[PDB]
Symmetry: C3
Amino acid sequence: KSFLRRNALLLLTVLAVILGVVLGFLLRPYPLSPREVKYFAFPGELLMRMLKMLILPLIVSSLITGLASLDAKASGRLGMRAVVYYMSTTIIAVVLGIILVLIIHPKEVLDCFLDLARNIFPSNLVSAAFRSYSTTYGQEVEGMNILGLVVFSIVFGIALGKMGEQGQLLVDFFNSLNEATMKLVAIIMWYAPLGILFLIAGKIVEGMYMVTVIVGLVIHGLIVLPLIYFLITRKNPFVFIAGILQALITALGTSSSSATLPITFKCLEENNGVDKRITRFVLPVGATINMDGTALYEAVAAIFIAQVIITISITATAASIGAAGIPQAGLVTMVIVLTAVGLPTDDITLIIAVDWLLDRFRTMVNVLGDALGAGIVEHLSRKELEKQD
Amino acid sequence: KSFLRRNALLLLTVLAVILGVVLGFLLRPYPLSPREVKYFAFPGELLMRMLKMLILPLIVSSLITGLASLDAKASGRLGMRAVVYYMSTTIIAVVLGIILVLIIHPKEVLDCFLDLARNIFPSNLVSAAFRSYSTTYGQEVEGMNILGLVVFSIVFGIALGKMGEQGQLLVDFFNSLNEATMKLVAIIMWYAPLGILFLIAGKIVEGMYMVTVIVGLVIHGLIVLPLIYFLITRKNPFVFIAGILQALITALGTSSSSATLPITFKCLEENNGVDKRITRFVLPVGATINMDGTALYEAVAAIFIAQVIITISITATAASIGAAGIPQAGLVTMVIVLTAVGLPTDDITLIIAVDWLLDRFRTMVNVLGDALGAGIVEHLSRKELEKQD
Amino acid sequence: KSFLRRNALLLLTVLAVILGVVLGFLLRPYPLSPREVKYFAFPGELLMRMLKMLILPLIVSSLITGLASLDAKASGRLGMRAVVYYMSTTIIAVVLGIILVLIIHPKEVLDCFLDLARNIFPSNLVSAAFRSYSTTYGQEVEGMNILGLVVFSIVFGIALGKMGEQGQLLVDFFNSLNEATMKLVAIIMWYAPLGILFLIAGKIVEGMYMVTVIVGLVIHGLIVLPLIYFLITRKNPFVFIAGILQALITALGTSSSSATLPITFKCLEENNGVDKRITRFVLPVGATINMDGTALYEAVAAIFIAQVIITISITATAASIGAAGIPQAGLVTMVIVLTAVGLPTDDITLIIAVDWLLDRFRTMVNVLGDALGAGIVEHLSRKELEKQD
Ligand SMILES: COc1ccc([C@@H]2C(C#N)=C(N)OC3=C2C(=O)C[C@@H](c2cccc4ccccc24)C3)cc1
Ligand SMILES: COc1ccc([C@@H]2C(C#N)=C(N)OC3=C2C(=O)C[C@@H](c2cccc4ccccc24)C3)cc1
Ligand SMILES: COc1ccc([C@@H]2C(C#N)=C(N)OC3=C2C(=O)C[C@@H](c2cccc4ccccc24)C3)cc1
Ligand SMILES: [Ba+2]
Ligand SMILES: [Ba+2]
Ligand SMILES: [Ba+2]
Ligand SMILES: [Ba+2]
Ligand SMILES: [Ba+2]
Ligand SMILES: [Ba+2]
């Protein structure tokens, strides 16, 4: 009884996964048009817009204060410590993908590197809050420029840090804004179980590589990542993963690390006891530039098509970073990557009917990586963080 | 002479209605293209963009401070007291509409209830400041999401209230912003007479049901509403209506309660002597969810078409709430409501050439309802308001 | 050696003009498609979006504080003193253009005056941050409404000034914001040489009137304008022009006074020693309503076409003010001005292949005029500025 009292919200999302599959299998025969499916998955659709709402005011207020609270010279130190984690875990994942196809084996290319550089520096900061640049044959398309806003907020935040007295007001303005948006997420946590159960039920009611990706994704998230945690922190990872259980189950239903960022934040500040100044530093960047989960799913999909190496690995990386939160992101990223090799897009019509579940697993590995990444950073922060205290 | 000195701006808008009809009748024969009509009604067109400008920064700053100044638990009490007024006056109006067709008698349906729930929770708060969602066969169309911004500002404002110390800065930021935008409306008041005279003159230069609606709209605004004021407040209503005379004449020319909201605000705070904390609480919501005036005009138009009950009443309600400030709002709302019954849209081509005057009358009944509603709330506020003082 | 140490950034942009023409002439034979030209001028293209980014938060924060710091009654005095400079230098330029075609001689019209009045009062302030109104046969087109934002910020800033105590917080908020965005421009200064050298190199790799315009533009910028400086200030102008050398060379590569505004600001506050309160007052307005450079190039192009007076002068003025920062601004402004006279648009296909260099020269005369204009204002400010101190 005592476990049910405390982990009330946690077990409810566990129950939402069970009852979501149950209701999905209860209404599996579909005599109704996919239009009626959209009207059924509506209580879960509402949950998405509530989270999407809160992304932009959180992701902006988090980085602006996070880099201003931290010393401008020590932030560069901690930054390199965080980048080391990002580049390493990405290298291991792309290496893991090659081994995963060695034993088992079941818009232009240059523009995907030009539009990424173009998105990093936003031409208009308001247009950045809802539009992303992508060269098509206007040029600015729908979906938040989360990369350009993260980049700007990192330099704008650091500029306030180098201002001190005058800059203090703006930092006090964004910290009250970060707390205000985090006080709104307190209610979105309770709508999540009702949402997720109607969200996954509508997504089930609509190929050995499908199992191949899950094999790699679990071996990375349960061996590679926890072993990288135990190596530096010297602390038990399944104690750290236990705290972020509410965030990982939401990622299992959201399929967006950027939309689960508000939950992950409360799953690290409140549950695992991580300093706000370093969750605001690691997590927003990890929700936009992490490749651990996506590159391990994209690259394996880029070798399966060759049946029907250095160049393929770099193109799969700039795919997800070039699509932070764009419409039909997974669909377009796999289309552009096939032009780089030359293989036909006939195989893509098959992956769409199965990506709906695999995109949830890759986000779950990404969310785990951002959380564990923040945890690994904390141990290398202890010298710079005590300096401010 | 002494009356002309004080009520200078008031009598000038009275003179604008007279001179506007006079100039309209002076230039009634139209050998000029409707393109030339648009160039003539330009000094009135400019007035609209000046008001439209100020809607968003007022409607956001009003609710955020209004709900933060008030106690988070007492706001829920006052809210229920306000909702009681909204639901009651709407029920009387829809009942009045049935009696008005008993004696005299001269995009999908489900989507109008899905898009309303979708608009309440905005997917992006910046996209909310200029776009509204509406499923069409992109999906987000032009016109402010005033409902989603009102909803967000009510929960964001209440979150600041539950913050106290940290939240104080943001509330001080929006209250200085509410005063700044209200200091800009001081000048827009003087442009209104020159505007309205060229606005109504261009709108006259371009069916017993036309008189039927005015019969119901005046009997509601002069009997139903003032009697609801005298019943609770026990104060003379035509003394309260006298103060809001500058706001009612602007509504007679604007045809938007949301665009007359900046005038109505100064017509209650300065003219009728109503506490800012409860004008900021009632009026913005009344300008977005009031049905007293619109449902009494929409429902009567929904029975006139049947010649050439419970289901018709609920659909006419979600029409205006689903079109807070959308392009050709009255045109699209009557198109979707005819699909729910089945009657042809042939009759709609006739109502457009006469709605231009009837939309001004419905807004006038709405504006009166929001003002009287705020007045009725004040008497039920006296216990909760003295608590803060 | 000592000159190279101090003027490090200055001589690097001088070197960028040299090496930019050199690299442009090194890669002048073009066997590559204009698509490949766009991929080559990319390190200069990135510089533009970095500046464009910073326009809106600078142009808004500059005017709001600038007019609030200054007395609301004295700002009207200084304003008339600034307007006098704008109207005079524009009259001399349009007169100079008539003399320049006397000795050498080598969407509707009304809508360009209706859309300008429509843009001055923005219908939505968020839509103003990225869209400008222009009647076409939706109605709001891409490109910032810099005029509507300048107009609003001037009245919003003055409203804060007339608020005092309550208004102080918002002014402290925008001044910390002006300093934050100006601390970001410190880095964009160093990217400028690498940018400009790849920006002009890509623009060279793609008619006596071409030389005629440069004759007028230099005689105005080296005689008319410096003589207007020496007449009032009684100080050497080529000492004042020397300080703004980093800003004039950026205008020679940017072709936008609005995008060089962040550099010009640091080129007057730091280099020439001009009071922030009057640079924030003159420069943003000068970057949006100046005609000295553009009207002297547009009007000369409006007489050259007549080969293949009062009405032509007023239409060329409302062209640039109607296109503050719109896509293909110089292309559309010359198209609409030919309809006013009646001459064919066949000559316009020839000016496009040469405007790329002439648009850089007109912006340079505009930037010089805004800087010298601010300098001339300072001497007429000394009484009103010492009053605040
Ligand atoms: C391309 O996507 C990115 C941008 C940033 C980061 C790192 C990060 C994380 N995680 C955060 N929170 O801050 C900084 C980072 C640095 O590497 C460097 C650090 C920094 C310090 C001082 C000056 C800087 C100037 C520009 C950019 C970063 C700067 C801040 C990683 C990837
Ligand atoms: C659908 O459109 C609406 C939204 C709000 C309202 C009411 C209102 C008015 N008028 C204002 N100013 O505040 C609140 C209202 C409540 O009913 C409840 C009240 C409230 C108190 C505490 C927590 C809340 C949480 C969510 C929403 C309202 C809350 C605030 C009416 C219709
Ligand atoms: C059409 O484009 C413009 C708008 C403004 C200006 C002038 C200017 C410059 N430069 C600045 N910084 O402030 C003011 C100006 C005034 O003429 C008048 C002055 C002013 C003082 C008091 C009340 C005002 C009310 C409305 C507008 C300006 C006002 C401010 C020039 C052209
Ligand atoms: Ba990584
Ligand atoms: Ba400090
Ligand atoms: Ba009502
Ligand atoms: Ba308090
Ligand atoms: Ba001028
Ligand atoms: Ba003061």
